[PDB]
RNA sequence: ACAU
DNA sequence: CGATGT
């Protein structure tokens, strides 16, 4: 119904899919960029969306913040809930880095706790998520 | 079909 | 138009 403005919003940006993947987290209210991941040479949209949420979890936990996280990705929200990123991306030398980060993100989820609500950004009602890459 |  | 996903 209503945007929870006291929140973190995340989004992925890519050059190709699969292709170069980056992501960032912003203050939903102000747009302030809170974290930005260095571009990853090959990954998928959904792996980036997943990494963005998990990074947001780690970011908020380190800062003792109970803010929720918004993502517009049905897929990544489910993957985080499951603690399992069910990507189809081939594992090879070229995809080694993104798969390493995804593996490590799952591992973090399986060794830490959090109460952070992970919320679906309702793009059809509210427009583009505040972390959008204007892409 | 829905979400990217 | 193509790809990633439930
Ligand atoms: K975009
Ligand atoms: K499809
Ligand atoms: Mg997105
Ligand atoms: Mg976007």
Edge-first strand listing for the sheet containing A33-43:
A33-43, A19-27, A8-16, A69-71, A118-120
Neighbours of ion ligand 1 (CB under 5 A): A 133, 135
Peptide bond into A18 cis (omega under 30): yes
Residue A69 tokens, joined: 């996280």
Which residues pair with residue A92 across a beta bridge? none
Residue A126: give the domain boundaries: 1-135
CA distances from A45 to A61, A64, A71, A72, A85 (A): 25, 29, 13, 12, 12
Give me the number of domains chain A comprises: 1
Q: What is the DSSP string of A13-48?
A: EEEETTEEEEEEEEETTT--EEEEEEEEEEE-HHHH
How far does the CA of A135 sit from the C1' of C1, in Å? 17
Quick count: other Cβ atoms within 10 Å of Cβ A92? 9
Experimental method: X-ray
Residue with tokens 């009602």, as numbered in its chain: A125
Kindly report the number of other CB atoms within 10 A of residue A108's CB atom: 15
Q: Which residues pair with A119 in a beta bridge?
A: A70
* Cα A53 to middle of ligand 1, angstroms: 17
What is the CATH number for A50? 3.30.420.10
Separation between Cα atoms, residue A77 and residue A85, nearest integer Å: 10
Distance CA A36, CA A48 (A): 12
Q: Which of A57, A121, A119 is nearest to A83 (CA)?
A: A57
Please give the nucleotide, over all strands, whose C1' is closest to the CA of residue A16. C3
Tokens 């403005």 locate to A5
The label of the residue with tokens 């603690």 reads: A83
């Amino acid at each position: 119904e209503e945007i929870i403005w006291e929140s973190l919003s995340v989004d992925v940006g890519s050059q190709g899919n699969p292709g170069i993947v980056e992501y960032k987290g912003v203050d939903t209210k102000t747009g302030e960029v809170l974290f930005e991941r260095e571009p990853i040479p090959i990954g998928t949209n959904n792996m980036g969306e997943f990494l963005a949420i998990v990074h947001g979890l780690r970011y908020l936990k380190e800062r003792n913040s109970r803010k929720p996280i918004y993502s517009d990705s049905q897929t990544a929200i489910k993957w985080v809930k499951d603690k399992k990123a069910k990507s189809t991306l081939v594992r090879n030398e070229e995809t080694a880095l993104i798969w390493k980060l995804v593996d490590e993100a799952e591992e973090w989820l399986n060794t830490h706790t959090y109460e952070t609500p992970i919320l679906k950004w309702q793009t059809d009602k509210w427009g583009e998520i505040k972390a959008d890459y204007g892409r």
